[PDB]
Design a protein around this ligand. Structure first.
Ligand SMILES: C[C@]12CCC(=O)C[C@@H]1CC[C@@H]1[C@@H]2CC[C@]2(C)[C@@H](O)CC[C@@H]12
Ligand SMILES: O=C(O)Cc1cc(I)c(Oc2ccc(O)c(I)c2)c(I)c1
Ligand SMILES: O=C(O)Cc1cc(I)c(Oc2ccc(O)c(I)c2)c(I)c1
Length: 248
Protein backbone atom coordinates (compact mmCIF):
# COMPACT_ATOMS: atom_id res chain seq x y z
CA UNK A 1 0.00 0.00 0.00
CA UNK A 2 0.86 3.69 0.28
CA UNK A 3 3.16 3.44 3.31
CA UNK A 4 5.42 0.81 1.74
CA UNK A 5 5.59 2.58 -1.60
CA UNK A 6 6.92 5.63 0.22
CA UNK A 7 9.50 3.78 2.30
CA UNK A 8 10.79 2.02 -0.81
CA UNK A 9 10.86 5.25 -2.84
CA UNK A 10 12.79 7.35 -0.31
CA UNK A 11 15.35 4.67 0.52
CA UNK A 12 18.86 6.06 -0.11
CA UNK A 13 21.03 4.57 -2.84
CA UNK A 14 24.73 3.75 -2.71
CA UNK A 15 27.07 6.08 -0.79
CA UNK A 16 30.83 5.84 -1.24
CA UNK A 17 33.31 6.62 1.53
CA UNK A 18 35.97 8.13 -0.71
CA UNK A 19 38.60 5.83 0.82
CA UNK A 20 41.80 5.19 -1.12
CA UNK A 21 42.12 1.41 -1.03
CA UNK A 22 45.55 1.75 -2.65
CA UNK A 23 46.90 2.89 0.71
CA UNK A 24 47.81 0.68 3.71
CA UNK A 25 45.08 -0.22 6.21
CA UNK A 26 46.19 1.93 9.13
CA UNK A 27 44.02 3.00 12.05
CA UNK A 28 44.26 6.69 11.08
CA UNK A 29 43.16 6.21 7.47
CA UNK A 30 40.45 3.64 8.17
CA UNK A 31 38.71 5.73 10.84
CA UNK A 32 39.15 8.95 8.89
CA UNK A 33 37.31 7.24 6.01
CA UNK A 34 34.69 5.85 8.37
CA UNK A 35 34.14 9.43 9.57
CA UNK A 36 33.95 10.85 6.04
CA UNK A 37 31.41 8.14 5.29
CA UNK A 38 29.51 9.11 8.41
CA UNK A 39 29.50 12.73 7.30
CA UNK A 40 28.24 11.67 3.86
CA UNK A 41 25.56 9.36 5.18
CA UNK A 42 24.37 12.14 7.50
CA UNK A 43 23.24 14.16 4.49
CA UNK A 44 21.13 11.29 3.11
CA UNK A 45 19.71 10.53 6.55
CA UNK A 46 18.46 14.11 6.92
CA UNK A 47 16.79 14.01 3.47
CA UNK A 48 15.42 10.50 4.03
CA UNK A 49 14.04 11.46 7.43
CA UNK A 50 12.32 14.61 6.14
CA UNK A 51 10.76 12.44 3.42
CA UNK A 52 9.15 10.11 5.96
CA UNK A 53 5.38 10.39 6.49
CA UNK A 54 4.61 12.85 9.30
CA UNK A 55 8.20 13.71 10.19
CA UNK A 56 7.95 17.28 8.90
CA UNK A 57 5.07 17.79 11.33
CA UNK A 58 7.33 17.42 14.38
CA UNK A 59 8.68 20.66 15.82
CA UNK A 60 11.75 21.66 13.81
CA UNK A 61 14.10 21.45 16.81
CA UNK A 62 12.81 17.95 17.53
CA UNK A 63 13.47 16.93 13.93
CA UNK A 64 17.14 17.82 14.27
CA UNK A 65 17.17 16.38 17.79
CA UNK A 66 16.00 12.89 16.81
CA UNK A 67 18.32 12.73 13.79
CA UNK A 68 21.32 13.79 15.89
CA UNK A 69 20.62 11.12 18.52
CA UNK A 70 19.64 8.25 16.21
CA UNK A 71 21.98 8.41 13.23
CA UNK A 72 24.38 5.83 14.68
CA UNK A 73 21.67 3.22 15.15
CA UNK A 74 20.16 4.06 11.75
CA UNK A 75 23.47 3.70 9.88
CA UNK A 76 24.54 0.58 11.78
CA UNK A 77 21.23 -1.10 10.95
CA UNK A 78 21.34 -0.14 7.27
CA UNK A 79 24.95 -1.32 7.12
CA UNK A 80 24.11 -4.69 8.67
CA UNK A 81 21.45 -5.11 6.01
CA UNK A 82 23.81 -4.07 3.20
CA UNK A 83 26.27 -6.59 4.58
CA UNK A 84 23.69 -9.36 4.50
CA UNK A 85 22.51 -8.65 0.93
CA UNK A 86 25.94 -7.82 -0.54
CA UNK A 87 28.35 -10.32 1.02
CA UNK A 88 25.96 -12.54 2.97
CA UNK A 89 27.23 -10.93 6.20
CA UNK A 90 30.76 -12.26 5.62
CA UNK A 91 32.23 -8.78 6.05
CA UNK A 92 31.05 -5.34 7.13
CA UNK A 93 29.91 -3.66 3.94
CA UNK A 94 30.18 -0.02 5.07
CA UNK A 95 30.49 1.16 1.47
CA UNK A 96 31.46 -0.31 -1.95
CA UNK A 97 34.87 1.25 -1.39
CA UNK A 98 34.98 0.40 2.32
CA UNK A 99 34.47 -3.29 3.09
CA UNK A 100 36.02 -4.50 6.34
CA UNK A 101 37.61 -7.94 6.48
CA UNK A 102 39.10 -9.57 9.58
CA UNK A 103 42.32 -7.63 9.15
CA UNK A 104 40.61 -4.24 8.94
CA UNK A 105 38.34 -5.04 11.88
CA UNK A 106 41.49 -5.47 13.95
CA UNK A 107 43.32 -2.48 12.45
CA UNK A 108 40.33 -0.23 13.23
CA UNK A 109 40.83 -0.98 16.94
CA UNK A 110 37.12 -1.76 17.34
CA UNK A 111 37.26 -5.49 16.61
CA UNK A 112 34.71 -6.63 19.18
CA UNK A 113 32.23 -3.94 18.15
CA UNK A 114 32.61 -5.04 14.53
CA UNK A 115 31.88 -8.56 15.72
CA UNK A 116 28.68 -7.35 17.37
CA UNK A 117 27.85 -5.63 14.09
CA UNK A 118 28.42 -8.78 12.04
CA UNK A 119 26.20 -10.70 14.50
CA UNK A 120 23.48 -8.10 13.94
CA UNK A 121 23.94 -8.45 10.18
CA UNK A 122 23.57 -12.23 10.45
CA UNK A 123 20.30 -11.85 12.36
CA UNK A 124 18.79 -10.59 9.12
CA UNK A 125 19.45 -14.07 7.79
CA UNK A 126 18.56 -16.19 10.79
CA UNK A 127 15.29 -14.30 11.10
CA UNK A 128 14.71 -14.24 7.34
CA UNK A 129 13.91 -10.54 7.51
CA UNK A 130 11.91 -9.35 4.51
CA UNK A 131 12.78 -6.08 2.73
CA UNK A 132 9.46 -4.65 3.93
CA UNK A 133 10.28 -5.44 7.57
CA UNK A 134 13.75 -3.95 7.19
CA UNK A 135 12.31 -0.70 5.86
CA UNK A 136 9.66 -0.30 8.58
CA UNK A 137 12.08 -1.34 11.33
CA UNK A 138 14.65 1.19 10.12
CA UNK A 139 12.05 3.95 10.05
CA UNK A 140 11.37 3.02 13.68
CA UNK A 141 14.98 3.45 14.75
CA UNK A 142 14.57 7.15 13.92
CA UNK A 143 11.96 7.28 16.71
CA UNK A 144 13.85 5.12 19.19
CA UNK A 145 15.95 7.54 21.22
CA UNK A 146 14.95 10.76 22.96
CA UNK A 147 15.92 12.99 25.92
CA UNK A 148 14.75 11.94 29.37
CA UNK A 149 13.13 15.35 29.78
CA UNK A 150 11.07 14.85 26.61
CA UNK A 151 11.07 16.69 23.29
CA UNK A 152 9.65 20.13 22.47
CA UNK A 153 6.47 18.30 21.42
CA UNK A 154 6.46 14.82 22.98
CA UNK A 155 2.75 14.34 22.31
CA UNK A 156 3.10 14.47 18.56
CA UNK A 157 6.24 12.37 18.77
CA UNK A 158 4.54 9.64 20.80
CA UNK A 159 1.64 9.73 18.33
CA UNK A 160 3.87 9.47 15.27
CA UNK A 161 5.99 6.72 16.80
CA UNK A 162 2.84 4.79 17.60
CA UNK A 163 1.65 5.03 14.00
CA UNK A 164 5.00 3.69 12.75
CA UNK A 165 4.69 0.76 15.12
CA UNK A 166 1.19 0.23 13.74
CA UNK A 167 2.60 0.15 10.20
CA UNK A 168 5.07 -2.49 11.34
CA UNK A 169 2.03 -4.46 12.51
CA UNK A 170 0.33 -4.29 9.12
CA UNK A 171 3.54 -5.50 7.48
CA UNK A 172 3.71 -8.40 9.94
CA UNK A 173 0.00 -9.20 9.64
CA UNK A 174 0.16 -9.08 5.84
CA UNK A 175 1.69 -12.53 5.33
CA UNK A 176 1.38 -14.68 8.47
CA UNK A 177 -1.55 -17.06 7.98
CA UNK A 178 -2.02 -18.03 11.66
CA UNK A 179 -2.27 -15.64 14.68
CA UNK A 180 0.42 -17.25 16.85
CA UNK A 181 3.03 -16.42 14.21
CA UNK A 182 2.34 -12.67 14.13
CA UNK A 183 2.65 -12.29 17.88
CA UNK A 184 5.84 -14.32 17.59
CA UNK A 185 7.17 -12.24 14.71
CA UNK A 186 6.47 -8.95 16.47
CA UNK A 187 8.39 -10.34 19.43
CA UNK A 188 11.33 -11.30 17.22
CA UNK A 189 11.48 -7.96 15.39
CA UNK A 190 11.15 -5.85 18.54
CA UNK A 191 13.96 -7.89 20.08
CA UNK A 192 16.05 -7.29 16.97
CA UNK A 193 15.33 -3.55 17.11
CA UNK A 194 16.35 -3.38 20.78
CA UNK A 195 19.56 -5.26 20.06
CA UNK A 196 20.64 -2.34 17.90
CA UNK A 197 20.83 0.05 20.84
CA UNK A 198 23.65 -1.66 22.82
CA UNK A 199 25.80 -1.71 19.67
CA UNK A 200 25.12 1.96 18.98
CA UNK A 201 25.98 2.84 22.56
CA UNK A 202 29.33 1.14 22.25
CA UNK A 203 30.12 2.98 19.02
CA UNK A 204 29.00 6.20 20.70
CA UNK A 205 31.55 5.63 23.46
CA UNK A 206 34.23 4.70 20.93
CA UNK A 207 33.79 7.66 18.59
CA UNK A 208 33.49 10.09 21.53
CA UNK A 209 36.77 8.92 23.03
CA UNK A 210 38.23 8.97 19.53
CA UNK A 211 37.23 12.59 18.89
CA UNK A 212 38.88 13.63 22.17
CA UNK A 213 42.24 12.16 21.15
CA UNK A 214 41.72 12.65 17.41
CA UNK A 215 44.66 15.07 17.15
CA UNK A 216 47.07 12.65 18.84
CA UNK A 217 46.17 9.64 16.68
CA UNK A 218 45.86 11.62 13.44
CA UNK A 219 42.19 10.89 12.78
CA UNK A 220 40.13 13.46 10.89
CA UNK A 221 36.53 14.27 11.84
CA UNK A 222 34.42 16.23 9.36
CA UNK A 223 32.59 19.34 10.57
CA UNK A 224 29.09 17.91 11.14
CA UNK A 225 30.41 14.72 12.78
CA UNK A 226 32.71 16.66 15.10
CA UNK A 227 29.96 18.99 16.33
CA UNK A 228 27.35 16.26 16.82
CA UNK A 229 29.78 13.98 18.60
CA UNK A 230 30.89 16.72 20.98
CA UNK A 231 27.45 18.25 21.50
CA UNK A 232 24.91 15.42 21.07
CA UNK A 233 26.65 12.11 21.76
CA UNK A 234 27.71 13.30 25.24
CA UNK A 235 24.06 13.78 26.19
CA UNK A 236 23.61 10.10 25.42
CA UNK A 237 26.76 9.00 27.21
CA UNK A 238 25.82 11.00 30.32
CA UNK A 239 22.35 9.48 30.40
CA UNK A 240 20.43 12.66 29.49
CA UNK A 241 19.22 11.08 26.24
CA UNK A 242 18.14 7.43 26.29
CA UNK A 243 16.93 4.75 23.84
CA UNK A 244 13.36 3.48 23.82
CA UNK A 245 13.40 -0.26 24.47
CA UNK A 246 10.42 -2.50 23.89
CA UNK A 247 11.70 -5.02 26.43
CA UNK A 248 13.59 -5.06 29.73
C1 LIG B 1 28.25 5.11 11.26
C2 LIG B 1 29.48 4.47 10.47
C3 LIG B 1 29.44 4.95 9.00
C4 LIG B 1 28.19 4.56 8.20
C5 LIG B 1 28.04 3.03 8.34
O1 LIG B 1 27.91 2.37 7.33
C6 LIG B 1 28.08 2.44 9.73
C7 LIG B 1 29.38 2.87 10.49
C8 LIG B 1 29.45 2.30 11.94
C9 LIG B 1 30.75 2.75 12.62
C10 LIG B 1 30.91 4.31 12.66
C11 LIG B 1 30.82 4.87 11.19
C12 LIG B 1 31.02 6.43 11.25
C13 LIG B 1 32.29 6.92 11.95
C14 LIG B 1 32.49 6.29 13.35
C15 LIG B 1 31.48 6.99 14.35
C16 LIG B 1 33.89 6.24 13.94
O2 LIG B 1 34.29 7.46 14.58
C17 LIG B 1 33.86 5.09 14.99
C18 LIG B 1 32.56 4.30 14.70
C19 LIG B 1 32.26 4.74 13.26
O1 LIG C 1 -0.86 3.35 5.95
C1 LIG C 1 -1.29 4.49 5.62
O2 LIG C 1 -2.47 4.78 5.31
C2 LIG C 1 -0.24 5.66 5.58
C3 LIG C 1 -0.04 6.40 6.86
C4 LIG C 1 1.18 6.37 7.49
C5 LIG C 1 1.38 7.14 8.72
I1 LIG C 1 3.19 7.06 9.77
C6 LIG C 1 0.33 7.92 9.26
O3 LIG C 1 0.61 8.69 10.41
C7 LIG C 1 0.61 10.12 10.50
C8 LIG C 1 0.22 10.78 11.69
C9 LIG C 1 0.20 12.19 11.73
C10 LIG C 1 0.58 12.93 10.58
O4 LIG C 1 0.60 14.34 10.61
C11 LIG C 1 0.97 12.24 9.39
I2 LIG C 1 1.45 13.28 7.65
C12 LIG C 1 0.98 10.86 9.38
C13 LIG C 1 -0.91 7.93 8.59
I3 LIG C 1 -2.49 9.05 9.39
C14 LIG C 1 -1.13 7.19 7.42
O1 LIG D 1 18.20 17.89 3.11
C1 LIG D 1 17.70 18.90 3.65
O2 LIG D 1 16.53 19.02 4.07
C2 LIG D 1 18.63 20.16 3.79
C3 LIG D 1 19.51 20.16 4.99
C4 LIG D 1 20.66 19.27 5.06
C5 LIG D 1 21.51 19.31 6.17
I1 LIG D 1 23.12 17.96 6.23
C6 LIG D 1 21.28 20.21 7.25
O3 LIG D 1 22.13 20.38 8.36
C7 LIG D 1 22.51 19.39 9.29
C8 LIG D 1 23.86 18.98 9.45
C9 LIG D 1 24.16 17.94 10.35
C10 LIG D 1 23.11 17.34 11.07
O4 LIG D 1 23.33 16.27 11.94
C11 LIG D 1 21.78 17.79 10.89
I2 LIG D 1 20.26 16.98 12.00
C12 LIG D 1 21.50 18.79 10.01
C13 LIG D 1 20.14 21.07 7.17
I3 LIG D 1 19.75 22.39 8.76
C14 LIG D 1 19.26 21.03 6.01
Amino acid sequence: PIFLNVLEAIEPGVVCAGHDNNQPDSFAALLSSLNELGERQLVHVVKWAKALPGFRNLHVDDQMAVIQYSWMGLMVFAMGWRSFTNVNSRMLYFAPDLVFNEYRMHKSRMYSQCVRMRHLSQEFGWLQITPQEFLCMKALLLFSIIPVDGLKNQKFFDELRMNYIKELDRIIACKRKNPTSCSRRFYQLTKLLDSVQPIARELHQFTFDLLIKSHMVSVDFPEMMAEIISVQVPKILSGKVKPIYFHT
